[PDB]
């Protein structure tokens, strides 16, 4: 099973979940940043609070694309992580089998 | 043709039009249509002189005030000799004052029958307006 305990069935792993949702792959972003006013932004945020994340996600993408300073800051922050060396360590006082698994 | 022979007769009675229009018979017997037509044309020409800068020339309709002004000017034009103190001359001067007031934008040209006149596009002109960066890009 997974960490959360939900039962795991290997049958469903052969195909992606979204494969049976061919409608999603054909969509295009609506670009809600164009012609954006403070009232529109407030409505977008409030609607996102209620479960309509599509408009918020598209607005965030436009915001990332259209602002050079914000984009540079975010890119620098992410590249900071991307350059870190990483390793996999066994648990506290792990046994030989655990060390081999790690 | 802001006024016709019928309008002149109605405003000044047929006797006076006959008296001031028949120049060859004494006493007058008939109204000379050519003389009346020329007088009306001259009145219309003066009115157009006054109204050319604010409205289109070939008006499709005749406002009522325009009819009164044209009738007065046409009657004043039918007098070969017109002195200063003649009351017809004073009426012509008052009508010319009305025309000048209209031209200087102090009086408006009234309704013709139900619709407005057609002002010229003199005030409309502006450069064009360059406002890029304000088209919801």
Query: What's the token pair of residue B121?
Result: 């596009």
The verdict on A35 touching B (C-beta cutoff 8 Å) is yes
The verdict on B137 touching A (C-beta cutoff 8 Å) is yes
Comparing C-alpha atoms, which of A67, A68, A61 is closest to residue A32?
A61
CA atoms within 13 A on the CB side of B132: 0
> Residue A88 — φ and ψ, nearest 5°?
-110, 125
- Give me the residue label for tokens 């409309």: B124
- Give me the residue label for tokens 């602002």: A67
Comparing C-alpha atoms, which of B50, B53, B98, B91 is closest to residue B72?
B91
Work out the number of other CB atoms within 10 angstroms of the CB of residue B44. 20
Q: Are B32 and B22 in contact (CB under 8 A)?
A: yes
Burial letters for B107-129: b for 16+ Cβ neighbours within 10 Å, e otherwise?
eebeebeeeebeeeeeeeeeeee
Nearest Cα residue in chain B from A37: B136
CB pairs under 8 A between A and B: 3
- Give me the residue label for tokens 């360590």: A89
User: What Å resolution does this PDB entry report?
Assistant: 3.1
Residues in chain B closer than 8 A to A35 (CB atoms):
136
């Amino acid at each position: 099973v997974d960490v959360y305990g939900n039962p795991i069935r290997t049958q469903q792993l052969r195909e992606p979940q979204t494969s049976r949702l061919a409608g999603l792959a054909k969509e295009f972003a609506q670009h809600p940043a164009k012609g954006l006013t403070p009232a529109k932004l407030a409505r977008i945020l409030v609607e996102a609070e209620q479960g309509n994340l599509q408009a918020q996600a598209e607005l965030f993408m436009d915001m990332e694309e259209r602002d050079a300073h914000l984009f540079a800051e975010m890119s620098k922050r992410k590249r900071a992580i991307l350059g870190l060396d990483w390793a996999v360590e066994p648990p506290r006082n792990a046994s030989a089998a655990e060390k081999a698994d790690a | 043709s802001y006024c016709t022979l019928a309008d002149l007769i109605e405003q000044y009675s047929e006797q006076k039009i006959r008296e001031v229009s028949d120049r060859v018979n004494k006493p007058a017997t008939t109204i000379d249509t050519v003389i009346v037509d020329r007088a009306i044309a001259d009145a219309d020409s003066e009115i157009d002189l006054h109204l050319h800068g604010r409205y289109q020339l070939p008006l499709a309709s005749v406002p009522t005030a325009l009819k009164r002004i044209a009738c007065g000017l046409a009657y004043a034009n039918l007098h070969i000799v017109l002195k200063e103190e003649n009351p017809v001359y004073k009426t012509a001067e008052h009508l010319r004052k009305l025309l000048s007031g209209i031209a200087n934008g102090k009086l408006s040209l009234a309704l013709d029958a139900d619709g407005k006149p057609a002002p010229v596009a003199n005030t409309v002109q502006i450069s064009e307006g360059r406002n890029d960066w304000g088209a919801d890009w």
